[PDB]
Amino acid sequence: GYIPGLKPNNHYGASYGEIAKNCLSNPKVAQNPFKLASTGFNYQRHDFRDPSLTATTHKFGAQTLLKNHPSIDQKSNQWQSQTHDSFRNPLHKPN
Amino acid sequence: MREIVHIQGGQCGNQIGAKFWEVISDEHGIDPTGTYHGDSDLQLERINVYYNEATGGRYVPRAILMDLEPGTMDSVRAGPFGQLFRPDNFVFGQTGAGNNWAKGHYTEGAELIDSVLDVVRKEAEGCDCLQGFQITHSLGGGTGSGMGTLLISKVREEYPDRIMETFSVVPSPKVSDTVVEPYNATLSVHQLVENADECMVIDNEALYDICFRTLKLTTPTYGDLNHLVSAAMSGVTCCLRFPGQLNSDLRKLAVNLIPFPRLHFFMIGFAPLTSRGSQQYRALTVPELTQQMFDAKNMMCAADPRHGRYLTASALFRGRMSTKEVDEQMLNVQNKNSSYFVEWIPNNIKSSICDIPPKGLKMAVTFVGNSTAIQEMFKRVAEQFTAMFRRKAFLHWYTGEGMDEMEFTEAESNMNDLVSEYQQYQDATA
Amino acid sequence: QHAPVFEDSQAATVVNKFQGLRQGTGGKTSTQLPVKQPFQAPNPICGAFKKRTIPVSEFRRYYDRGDLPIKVDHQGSVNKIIWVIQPDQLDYHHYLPIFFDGLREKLDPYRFLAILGTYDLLEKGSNKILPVIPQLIIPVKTALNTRDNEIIGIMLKILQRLVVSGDMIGEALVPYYRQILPIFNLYKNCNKNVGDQIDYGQRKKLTLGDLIQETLELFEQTGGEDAFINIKYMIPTYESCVHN
Amino acid sequence: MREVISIHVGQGGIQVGNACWELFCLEHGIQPDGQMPSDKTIGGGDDAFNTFFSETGAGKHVPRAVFLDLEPTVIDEVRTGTYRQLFHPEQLISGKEDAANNFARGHYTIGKEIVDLCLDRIRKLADNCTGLQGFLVFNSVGGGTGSGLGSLLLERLSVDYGKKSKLGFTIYPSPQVSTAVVEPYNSILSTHSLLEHTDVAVMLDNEAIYDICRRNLDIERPTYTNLNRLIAQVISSLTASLRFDGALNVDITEFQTNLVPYPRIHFMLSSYAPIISAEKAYHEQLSVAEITNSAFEPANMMAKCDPRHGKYMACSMMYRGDVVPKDVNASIATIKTKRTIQFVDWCPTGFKVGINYQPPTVVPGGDLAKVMRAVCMISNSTAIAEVFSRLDHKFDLMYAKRAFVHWYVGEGMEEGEFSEAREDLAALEKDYEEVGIET
Amino acid sequence: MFKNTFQSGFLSILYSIGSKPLQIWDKSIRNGHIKRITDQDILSSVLEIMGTNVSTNYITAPADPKETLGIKLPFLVMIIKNLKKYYTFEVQVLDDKNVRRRFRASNYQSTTRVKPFICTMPMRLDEGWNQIQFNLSDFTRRAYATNYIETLRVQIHANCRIRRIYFSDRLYSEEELPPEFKLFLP
Ligand SMILES: Nc1nc2c(ncn2[C@@H]2O[C@H](COP(=O)(O)OP(=O)(O)OP(=O)(O)O)[C@@H](O)[C@H]2O)c(=O)[nH]1
Ligand SMILES: Nc1nc2c(ncn2[C@@H]2O[C@H](COP(=O)(O)OP(=O)(O)O)[C@@H](O)[C@H]2O)c(=O)[nH]1
Ligand SMILES: [Mg+2]
């Protein structure tokens, strides 16, 4: 049932136990930036405003894309996977 | 290393590139003035293929804006990011081809093309190890059709071992822009095929259909059409400027898509491309990218892909994605349309991966496929041209500038012949 | 024409029980009920070998009004042509394009007056053929565009007689290879797999596949040094002949 | 006084070759910079670093490899990463223009400008070692650079050094899934050159591993980074006896003496087990008897070839871990009893058993979980006739109209070369059948 | 097949002049074509095979697998028009020790090596009608130093025309041969 991580955004290759661990333990998947209510009554307070528009016409008509994309973190696949020791020990388990 | 230079001509060529560099400029993070303002180490690792250095620290686009009239090249400078072009690169005449393929191919282009070739020589010589050229031009414009086509001919006489990529926009039957389109378009292909290492057909008709069915944007503008074509520009060289799991240069793509020496015409497409308002809802997950790749509407050319069978296709997947499901989807799309794929070339789908997405997306796919459909464009162009010739309509300008009536019929044999011979492999079986 | 009495058409094995309006696919949502197969597109075949519909040929226009001097004698068993004037003086550069335009014609007597006329010019003609080579391509090209077994066969007999007729004529066809060759690609391997059983097409070489090969070979020997290099760009299947 | 020189050619070799070193680097307490820490030393025995490393006198060490590739992008990545300090600067020899999958390009026209330098670097490393046992060569057949460079380098080596043994860990194209479109062409040519110049070459087809990954690790999103790692473990297995203590060891020279019945038939396919993730690796005993069962399970074979369609010639199946010899006796006997594994008539017993104690290591950040016992098998079976069977058939279709041919004839190679490869592959087809016929 | 049968002077495994030219032989063609015609060099019927993909097309001696064509005839000869394309022909032999030897001849190969199962060698075919007398006795003794008992199989691929195939049993000149075997000049 619905690992919030896998289907929505593609995850790079890894173990199913490890990949699942990373998602439900990270932030997000919670917290309301706008404070709308579950009942559906805080609706009239929020404005439902998307800040990804400027205008157009008479030159260019595409408009840039919404914040659902990466930046700054751009780094090849080789970087993430290959490193010597800057990762959690496979068998640490403090006791 | 393995750098490229850009030589573009015609008003269609000059404007189209202007959004081509602007799109390229942002990706590397080079601001209009020329001072680095990027964010990543990889951003500059391969700034040498398209950009050159000079004391002062700013970068130059290795292009030579060439056209036969002063308006176009004076205008492009004033545009945004319009300061990058080197003033010495500009070359232009003082008469104007007047949409006459004769003017830009025998009488006017010849006189001026002597110098423009010199700048081609200088830029080409400096590079470390030249790879090839990417030519932009529209076959419907006299000066563009003639001067652009005559420029390549001598170029093939000096660098026999370098690749030549040409982007042409052919006049579709639905919407036409010049009464003399069929004459100039028919002549051009006679020489482009024999000289160009690769030429990709682009149809204006498809774009306006694309802008509505997918974009749904109410008011498309000449910017909108340019944006889509520019995007596919980065696809062919997307992984050449970055590291990745599987490198793929222009030569490798050519080595795997041209079955026989006489077939070097392709058609392209871009994805994902979803309406502005409804962009937050879709899920960008591998299959959604591929299915949008093979749909008829997304195809950049007015020719219907499913009116013929694919001889081969190459998809340059780009971004972060596991290779296995990248490959598995390709296999699934090879049986489900088994008949639609020619059966004497087993396993006829090619794949590639690059790990640097542009600004605004997490995954995308650039499509370059060779399909039997393109016979529709040549026939339709062939049919109209054959109609105007029997009555000597509009012929009297070309004949007055050094040409003879015989020269056109020689073109007629070539255009149709390639039309028939293209379909010869469309029906052969084991 | 005739038509069967369609209505009386009968069926025997099928039973005469009628299901009626009462049916219903509801209430029995099992896992093996029949599923309608969705409509599917047919496999496109296109125009590999369809007829080409040869256009109007110039031959009749000249003979109809009496401008090509030629007569159909009958003294011999088979019609043998007689030249009105001794064919040495004729301006080959003028009429020669007219003749090969006749290759298309099949109806008598033009078709008979078409081929036989061509042969005579190339036999006695020795040196004045060469200047006419550039203009000879146009009539022949579409003829190879006919895609008709009767039409295509004769020219192959025509071509062989064309090249070795005069010295140095063979090489001049090399730069024109880009136009004559195309058609040869299609029929290269259309032969009959009769096997051990004998093939009697010996007296009449109507086997299209075999006829082609002998045509290409004769070109390269007479083509010269550049005979082989250009050929490979049109029909890949060819294998070097002059070279060991 | 024992050593081996590693050669990586082509991106497929380089990327997998990159993988094979992290496993080798960790297995002896050498950090990426190459310097052994003065504290926290785990070293059992001495000279263990000598099998693949050479001392620099004080401090760090060096790898015994030479990387070759004409595409700067793949090579340039390593020199800017976290292993820059490891390799010797002037052994990553590379060019400027890509091979472009034209097998002739890397073997007649473009390759000749780099092969000369590559051999000279080989001369320098030959003198440094004492009694070199053999070379390990990695390359992906499906590429001209790997296929083109591999043939040229091997032929030069076979004449330069002589009788020394060489091993090739190739990666052949899959039955249905293949990335390139010209892979069939360069496959036939490659085997022609590699059949007459190599001692032992194994099969590592990509498609099979994808099935290997899915069944056990339970991961539907694999990538080449995970793929290559699995080959790393098998790389470690084949060499466990050259740098460690044991009860019954095997030398590399004892491979051309137990696994190749005839000079021609020397293609063998591997299999690895167990590979159980950390999420499930600790709910079973992993007995020696049961583990060897997974070794011969048809699905886990290293390549997409079902062994059940043929004979089993000889399986020099190795061990690492906590294996007592008495248990191995019970494992070999049980395999012969089963009726689904049938051998040849002229090979009564076809097992060469080996044992080593140093247990497999765990590479951080990977997928594998730690285990006690591991068995890697190098098995020669008559089923390999299939892989060559399909490859030859594919070649027939494309060359009937000889499409794609004219991109090669322009590289200077004679036309007759393409047909000649068919004689080598086709003739090989008739040989397997003759080996298996009962007399 | 042909065992316990007399073999002294001549043996006509294959021929072209007859009601049924090929009954013992078996055919398997995928892209080629098989037929017979009259040749312009020698006025007689000759069997011809042409095609591409030299390896795919062939015609085998034994009717089906799993049997033998053992013959004690010391020599092998064969008449073939030189078509000036790819050409091959291979035979398999049995030595004193129970081993299987097959020799394959190629016109398009210039380098030869012996091998435990295959021993390649080049040829040269001249224009005009020609005949080749493959020794089959010294060659086997020059590659493996093991005498030859019999020849197991004779195989001919495509791109050639053959009038007759026969085994010599001793060196024969033009004079000795009866009228039939001799190839009378046009
Ligand atoms: N096992 C494995 N195989 C790979 C990997 N990357 C590519 N391949 C194989 O390599 C084949 C294509 O060749 P490439 O790896 O792209 O490189 P190449 O063969 O050396 O040829 P070039 O790229 O021109 O240098 C594909 O068919 C894959 O099977 C990888 O990361 N792991
Ligand atoms: N993509 C794009 N194409 C354009 C634009 N404006 C014109 N065109 C194309 O340019 C063609 C006409 O080119 P033309 O001006 O005659 O070329 P010239 O003769 O060299 O100046 C038409 O077919 C249009 O499709 C534009 O803003 N964007
Ligand atoms: Mg490469």
Short mmCIF file of all heavy atoms in Angstrom, two decimals, chain B residues 2 46 131 245-247 252 255-256 258-259 261 321-325 344 346-347 351, chain D residues 11 15 73 76 97-98 100-101 176 178-179 181-183 221-222 224 398 403-404 406-407:
data_model
loop_
_atom_site.label_atom_id
_atom_site.label_comp_id
_atom_site.label_asym_id
_atom_site.label_seq_id
_atom_site.Cartn_x
_atom_site.Cartn_y
_atom_site.Cartn_z
N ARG B 2 35.88 17.86 -29.89
CA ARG B 2 34.69 17.51 -30.67
C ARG B 2 33.67 18.64 -30.64
O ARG B 2 32.49 18.45 -30.35
CB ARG B 2 34.09 16.20 -30.19
CG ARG B 2 33.54 16.22 -28.77
CD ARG B 2 33.65 14.84 -28.13
NE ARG B 2 32.63 14.63 -27.10
CZ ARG B 2 32.62 15.23 -25.92
NH1 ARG B 2 33.56 16.10 -25.58
NH2 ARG B 2 31.64 14.96 -25.06
N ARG B 46 32.07 21.41 -19.96
CA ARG B 46 32.01 21.26 -21.41
C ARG B 46 31.48 22.52 -22.08
O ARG B 46 30.68 22.45 -23.01
CB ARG B 46 31.16 20.05 -21.79
CG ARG B 46 31.72 18.73 -21.31
CD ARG B 46 33.23 18.71 -21.45
NE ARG B 46 33.80 17.41 -21.12
CZ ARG B 46 34.85 16.88 -21.73
NH1 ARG B 46 35.47 17.52 -22.71
NH2 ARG B 46 35.28 15.68 -21.35
N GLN B 131 34.05 18.36 -35.27
CA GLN B 131 33.14 17.22 -35.37
C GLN B 131 32.17 17.36 -36.54
O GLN B 131 32.04 16.44 -37.35
CB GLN B 131 32.36 17.06 -34.06
CG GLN B 131 31.61 15.75 -33.96
CD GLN B 131 32.51 14.58 -33.63
OE1 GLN B 131 33.43 14.71 -32.81
NE2 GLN B 131 32.26 13.44 -34.26
N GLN B 245 25.33 7.74 -18.27
CA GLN B 245 25.49 6.29 -18.25
C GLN B 245 25.93 5.76 -19.61
O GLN B 245 26.74 4.83 -19.69
CB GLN B 245 24.19 5.64 -17.80
CG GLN B 245 23.79 6.03 -16.40
CD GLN B 245 24.74 5.48 -15.36
OE1 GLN B 245 25.18 4.33 -15.46
NE2 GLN B 245 25.09 6.30 -14.38
N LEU B 246 25.41 6.35 -20.69
CA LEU B 246 25.76 5.95 -22.06
C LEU B 246 25.96 7.21 -22.89
O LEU B 246 25.01 7.97 -23.11
CB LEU B 246 24.69 5.06 -22.67
CG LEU B 246 24.76 3.56 -22.40
CD1 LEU B 246 24.47 3.27 -20.95
CD2 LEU B 246 23.77 2.84 -23.30
N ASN B 247 27.18 7.44 -23.34
CA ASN B 247 27.43 8.57 -24.22
C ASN B 247 26.77 8.34 -25.57
O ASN B 247 26.57 7.20 -26.00
CB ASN B 247 28.93 8.80 -24.40
CG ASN B 247 29.65 7.57 -24.91
OD1 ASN B 247 30.00 6.67 -24.14
ND2 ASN B 247 29.88 7.52 -26.22
N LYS B 252 27.47 8.71 -33.67
CA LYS B 252 26.84 7.45 -33.27
C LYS B 252 25.38 7.41 -33.69
O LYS B 252 24.89 6.37 -34.16
CB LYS B 252 26.96 7.26 -31.76
CG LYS B 252 26.55 5.88 -31.28
CD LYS B 252 26.65 5.77 -29.76
CE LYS B 252 28.09 5.64 -29.32
NZ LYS B 252 28.20 5.40 -27.85
N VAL B 255 25.35 6.71 -37.29
CA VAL B 255 25.84 5.38 -37.64
C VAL B 255 24.76 4.33 -37.43
O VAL B 255 24.89 3.19 -37.90
CB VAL B 255 27.11 5.05 -36.83
CG1 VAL B 255 27.44 3.57 -36.93
CG2 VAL B 255 28.27 5.90 -37.31
N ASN B 256 23.67 4.68 -36.75
CA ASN B 256 22.66 3.70 -36.37
C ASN B 256 21.27 4.01 -36.90
O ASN B 256 20.33 3.26 -36.61
CB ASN B 256 22.61 3.59 -34.84
CG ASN B 256 23.90 3.06 -34.26
OD1 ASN B 256 24.29 1.92 -34.50
ND2 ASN B 256 24.58 3.90 -33.49
N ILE B 258 20.76 5.54 -40.42
CA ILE B 258 20.71 5.64 -41.87
C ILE B 258 20.96 4.27 -42.49
O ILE B 258 22.13 3.89 -42.68
CB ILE B 258 21.72 6.68 -42.39
CG1 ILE B 258 21.38 8.07 -41.85
CG2 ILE B 258 21.76 6.68 -43.90
CD1 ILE B 258 22.02 8.39 -40.52
N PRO B 259 19.92 3.51 -42.82
CA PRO B 259 20.16 2.16 -43.34
C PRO B 259 20.99 2.15 -44.60
O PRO B 259 22.03 1.48 -44.66
CB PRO B 259 18.74 1.63 -43.58
CG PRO B 259 17.85 2.49 -42.76
CD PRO B 259 18.49 3.84 -42.75
N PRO B 261 22.75 4.47 -48.05
CA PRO B 261 23.39 5.78 -48.24
C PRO B 261 22.44 6.87 -48.72
O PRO B 261 22.73 8.05 -48.52
CB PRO B 261 24.48 5.49 -49.27
CG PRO B 261 24.06 4.22 -49.94
CD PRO B 261 23.34 3.43 -48.91
N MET B 321 17.04 8.19 -14.42
CA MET B 321 16.11 7.08 -14.49
C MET B 321 16.90 5.78 -14.61
O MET B 321 17.93 5.74 -15.27
CB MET B 321 15.15 7.23 -15.66
CG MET B 321 15.84 7.31 -17.01
SD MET B 321 16.81 8.81 -17.19
CE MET B 321 15.53 10.05 -16.98
N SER B 322 16.40 4.74 -13.96
CA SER B 322 17.07 3.45 -14.03
C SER B 322 17.01 2.90 -15.45
O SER B 322 15.96 2.93 -16.10
CB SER B 322 16.43 2.46 -13.06
OG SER B 322 15.25 1.89 -13.61
N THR B 323 18.14 2.38 -15.91
CA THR B 323 18.24 1.95 -17.31
C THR B 323 17.28 0.81 -17.63
O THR B 323 16.78 0.73 -18.75
CB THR B 323 19.67 1.54 -17.64
OG1 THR B 323 20.55 2.65 -17.43
CG2 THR B 323 19.76 1.11 -19.09
N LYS B 324 17.02 -0.08 -16.67
CA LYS B 324 16.26 -1.28 -16.99
C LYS B 324 14.87 -0.94 -17.51
O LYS B 324 14.47 -1.41 -18.58
CB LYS B 324 16.17 -2.20 -15.77
CG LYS B 324 15.53 -3.54 -16.09
CD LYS B 324 15.46 -4.45 -14.88
CE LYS B 324 14.27 -5.38 -14.97
NZ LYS B 324 12.99 -4.62 -14.97
N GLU B 325 14.13 -0.11 -16.78
CA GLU B 325 12.79 0.23 -17.24
C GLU B 325 12.83 1.16 -18.44
O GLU B 325 11.84 1.25 -19.18
CB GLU B 325 11.96 0.85 -16.12
CG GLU B 325 12.49 2.14 -15.56
CD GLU B 325 11.77 2.54 -14.28
OE1 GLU B 325 10.62 2.08 -14.07
OE2 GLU B 325 12.34 3.31 -13.48
N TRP B 344 12.67 -6.94 -41.45
CA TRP B 344 14.00 -7.43 -41.80
C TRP B 344 15.11 -6.69 -41.07
O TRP B 344 16.28 -6.80 -41.45
CB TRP B 344 14.21 -7.39 -43.31
CG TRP B 344 14.17 -6.03 -43.94
CD1 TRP B 344 13.07 -5.41 -44.44
CD2 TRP B 344 15.27 -5.16 -44.18
NE1 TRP B 344 13.41 -4.19 -44.95
CE2 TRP B 344 14.76 -4.01 -44.81
CE3 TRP B 344 16.64 -5.23 -43.92
CZ2 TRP B 344 15.57 -2.95 -45.18
CZ3 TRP B 344 17.44 -4.17 -44.28
CH2 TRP B 344 16.90 -3.04 -44.91
N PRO B 346 15.73 -6.75 -37.15
CA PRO B 346 15.24 -7.11 -35.82
C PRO B 346 15.75 -6.15 -34.75
O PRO B 346 16.85 -5.61 -34.84
CB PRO B 346 15.80 -8.52 -35.61
CG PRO B 346 17.02 -8.55 -36.45
CD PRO B 346 16.70 -7.72 -37.66
N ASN B 347 14.91 -5.95 -33.73
CA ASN B 347 15.25 -5.11 -32.58
C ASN B 347 15.65 -3.71 -33.05
O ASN B 347 16.80 -3.27 -32.92
CB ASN B 347 16.36 -5.75 -31.74
CG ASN B 347 16.50 -5.09 -30.39
OD1 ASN B 347 17.58 -4.61 -30.03
ND2 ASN B 347 15.41 -5.05 -29.63
N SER B 351 18.28 3.40 -27.91
CA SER B 351 18.09 4.18 -26.69
C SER B 351 19.40 4.83 -26.27
O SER B 351 20.49 4.38 -26.63
CB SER B 351 17.57 3.31 -25.55
OG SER B 351 18.62 2.57 -24.96
N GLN D 11 33.82 1.78 -22.67
CA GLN D 11 33.01 2.26 -21.56
C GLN D 11 32.45 1.11 -20.75
O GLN D 11 32.46 1.15 -19.51
CB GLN D 11 31.89 3.15 -22.08
CG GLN D 11 31.17 3.92 -21.00
CD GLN D 11 29.85 4.49 -21.47
OE1 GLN D 11 28.79 4.01 -21.08
NE2 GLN D 11 29.92 5.50 -22.31
N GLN D 15 33.33 1.24 -16.91
CA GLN D 15 32.35 1.38 -15.84
C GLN D 15 32.33 0.14 -14.95
O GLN D 15 32.33 0.25 -13.72
CB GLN D 15 30.96 1.65 -16.42
CG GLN D 15 29.90 1.92 -15.37
CD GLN D 15 28.55 2.27 -15.98
OE1 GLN D 15 28.39 2.28 -17.20
NE2 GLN D 15 27.58 2.56 -15.12
N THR D 73 34.60 11.71 -22.46
CA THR D 73 33.61 11.93 -21.41
C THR D 73 33.69 10.85 -20.34
O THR D 73 33.73 11.15 -19.15
CB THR D 73 32.21 11.99 -22.01
OG1 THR D 73 32.13 13.07 -22.95
CG2 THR D 73 31.17 12.21 -20.91
N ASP D 76 37.15 11.12 -18.53
CA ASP D 76 37.34 12.36 -17.79
C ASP D 76 36.59 12.36 -16.46
O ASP D 76 36.96 13.09 -15.53
CB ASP D 76 36.89 13.55 -18.64
CG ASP D 76 37.85 13.85 -19.77
OD1 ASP D 76 39.08 13.72 -19.57
OD2 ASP D 76 37.38 14.22 -20.87
N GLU D 97 38.22 11.45 -30.85
CA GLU D 97 37.06 11.12 -31.67
C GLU D 97 36.50 9.77 -31.25
O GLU D 97 37.27 8.82 -31.02
CB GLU D 97 37.42 11.10 -33.15
CG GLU D 97 36.26 10.77 -34.07
CD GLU D 97 35.15 11.81 -33.99
OE1 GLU D 97 35.44 12.97 -33.65
OE2 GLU D 97 33.98 11.45 -34.28
N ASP D 98 35.18 9.68 -31.16
CA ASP D 98 34.53 8.45 -30.73
C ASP D 98 34.55 7.41 -31.84
O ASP D 98 34.64 7.73 -33.03
CB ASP D 98 33.08 8.74 -30.31
CG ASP D 98 32.33 7.48 -29.90
OD1 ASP D 98 32.99 6.47 -29.60
OD2 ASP D 98 31.08 7.52 -29.89
N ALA D 100 32.07 5.46 -32.69
CA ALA D 100 30.81 5.57 -33.43
C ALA D 100 30.33 4.20 -33.90
O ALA D 100 29.75 4.06 -34.98
CB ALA D 100 30.95 6.54 -34.60
N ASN D 101 30.57 3.18 -33.08
CA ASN D 101 30.04 1.84 -33.28
C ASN D 101 30.45 1.22 -34.61
O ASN D 101 29.93 0.16 -34.97
CB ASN D 101 28.51 1.82 -33.15
CG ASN D 101 28.05 2.05 -31.73
OD1 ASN D 101 27.08 2.78 -31.50
ND2 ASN D 101 28.73 1.44 -30.78
N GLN D 176 16.22 -10.51 -26.73
CA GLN D 176 15.24 -9.55 -27.22
C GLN D 176 15.55 -8.11 -26.84
O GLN D 176 15.27 -7.21 -27.63
CB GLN D 176 13.84 -9.88 -26.70
CG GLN D 176 13.63 -9.61 -25.23
CD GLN D 176 14.04 -10.77 -24.35
OE1 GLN D 176 14.75 -11.67 -24.80
NE2 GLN D 176 13.59 -10.76 -23.11
N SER D 178 17.98 -5.10 -26.37
CA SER D 178 19.30 -4.60 -26.70
C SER D 178 19.20 -3.11 -27.00
O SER D 178 18.30 -2.68 -27.73
CB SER D 178 19.90 -5.33 -27.90
OG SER D 178 19.17 -5.08 -29.08
N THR D 179 20.12 -2.34 -26.43
CA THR D 179 20.10 -0.89 -26.56
C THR D 179 20.44 -0.42 -27.97
O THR D 179 19.73 0.42 -28.53
CB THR D 179 21.08 -0.26 -25.57
OG1 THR D 179 20.69 -0.60 -24.23
CG2 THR D 179 21.09 1.25 -25.72
N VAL D 181 21.32 -0.68 -32.20
CA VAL D 181 20.65 -1.24 -33.36
C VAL D 181 21.61 -1.97 -34.29
O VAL D 181 21.15 -2.70 -35.19
CB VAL D 181 19.88 -0.17 -34.15
CG1 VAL D 181 20.84 0.84 -34.76
CG2 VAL D 181 19.02 -0.81 -35.23
N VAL D 182 22.92 -1.80 -34.11
CA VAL D 182 23.92 -2.45 -34.94
C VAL D 182 24.69 -3.50 -34.16
O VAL D 182 25.71 -4.01 -34.64
CB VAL D 182 24.87 -1.42 -35.56
CG1 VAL D 182 25.73 -0.78 -34.48
CG2 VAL D 182 25.74 -2.05 -36.63
N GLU D 183 24.23 -3.85 -32.96
CA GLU D 183 24.96 -4.81 -32.14
C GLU D 183 25.16 -6.15 -32.83
O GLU D 183 26.25 -6.74 -32.66
CB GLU D 183 24.26 -5.00 -30.79
CG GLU D 183 22.94 -5.74 -30.86
CD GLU D 183 21.78 -4.84 -31.22
OE1 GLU D 183 22.03 -3.73 -31.72
OE2 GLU D 183 20.62 -5.25 -31.01
N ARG D 221 13.56 -1.29 -9.89
CA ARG D 221 14.16 -0.08 -10.46
C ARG D 221 15.68 -0.21 -10.46
O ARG D 221 16.39 0.54 -9.78
CB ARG D 221 13.71 1.15 -9.68
CG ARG D 221 14.47 2.44 -9.96
CD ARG D 221 14.05 3.11 -11.25
NE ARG D 221 14.19 4.56 -11.16
CZ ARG D 221 13.92 5.41 -12.15
NH1 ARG D 221 13.51 4.98 -13.33
NH2 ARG D 221 14.09 6.71 -11.94
N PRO D 222 16.22 -1.18 -11.19
CA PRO D 222 17.68 -1.35 -11.25
C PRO D 222 18.34 -0.49 -12.32
O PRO D 222 17.74 -0.14 -13.33
CB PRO D 222 17.83 -2.84 -11.57
CG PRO D 222 16.63 -3.15 -12.37
CD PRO D 222 15.51 -2.30 -11.83
N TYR D 224 22.59 0.45 -14.06
CA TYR D 224 23.89 -0.17 -14.31
C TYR D 224 24.79 -0.12 -13.08
O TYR D 224 25.68 -0.98 -12.94
CB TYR D 224 24.58 0.50 -15.50
CG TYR D 224 23.92 0.25 -16.84
CD1 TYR D 224 24.25 1.02 -17.94
CD2 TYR D 224 22.99 -0.75 -17.00
CE1 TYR D 224 23.66 0.80 -19.16
CE2 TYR D 224 22.39 -0.98 -18.22
CZ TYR D 224 22.73 -0.20 -19.30
OH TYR D 224 22.14 -0.42 -20.52
N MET D 398 19.81 -9.12 -41.82
CA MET D 398 20.22 -7.76 -42.14
C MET D 398 21.16 -7.72 -43.33
O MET D 398 21.22 -6.70 -44.03
CB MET D 398 20.88 -7.11 -40.93
CG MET D 398 19.93 -6.93 -39.75
SD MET D 398 20.57 -5.80 -38.50
CE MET D 398 19.22 -5.82 -37.33
N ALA D 403 21.89 -4.05 -45.64
CA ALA D 403 21.70 -2.75 -45.04
C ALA D 403 22.75 -2.51 -43.96
O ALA D 403 23.24 -3.44 -43.32
CB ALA D 403 20.30 -2.62 -44.44
N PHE D 404 23.11 -1.24 -43.77
CA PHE D 404 24.13 -0.80 -42.82
C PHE D 404 25.53 -1.21 -43.25
O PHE D 404 26.50 -0.87 -42.56
CB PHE D 404 23.87 -1.33 -41.41
CG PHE D 404 22.67 -0.73 -40.75
CD1 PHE D 404 21.41 -1.26 -40.97
CD2 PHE D 404 22.79 0.36 -39.91
CE1 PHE D 404 20.30 -0.72 -40.37
CE2 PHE D 404 21.69 0.91 -39.31
CZ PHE D 404 20.44 0.37 -39.54
N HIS D 406 27.28 -0.23 -45.87
CA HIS D 406 28.09 0.79 -46.52
C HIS D 406 28.71 1.77 -45.54
O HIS D 406 29.54 2.58 -45.96
CB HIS D 406 27.27 1.54 -47.57
CG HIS D 406 26.46 2.66 -47.01
ND1 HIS D 406 25.42 2.46 -46.13
CD2 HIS D 406 26.52 4.00 -47.22
CE1 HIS D 406 24.88 3.62 -45.81
NE2 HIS D 406 25.53 4.57 -46.46
N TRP D 407 28.34 1.74 -44.27
CA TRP D 407 29.07 2.50 -43.26
C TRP D 407 30.39 1.85 -42.87
O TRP D 407 31.20 2.49 -42.19
CB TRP D 407 28.22 2.70 -42.00
CG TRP D 407 27.10 3.66 -42.17
CD1 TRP D 407 25.80 3.37 -42.44
CD2 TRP D 407 27.18 5.09 -42.07
NE1 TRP D 407 25.06 4.52 -42.52
CE2 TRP D 407 25.89 5.59 -42.29
CE3 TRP D 407 28.22 5.98 -41.82
CZ2 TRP D 407 25.61 6.96 -42.27
CZ3 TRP D 407 27.94 7.33 -41.79
CH2 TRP D 407 26.65 7.81 -42.02
#
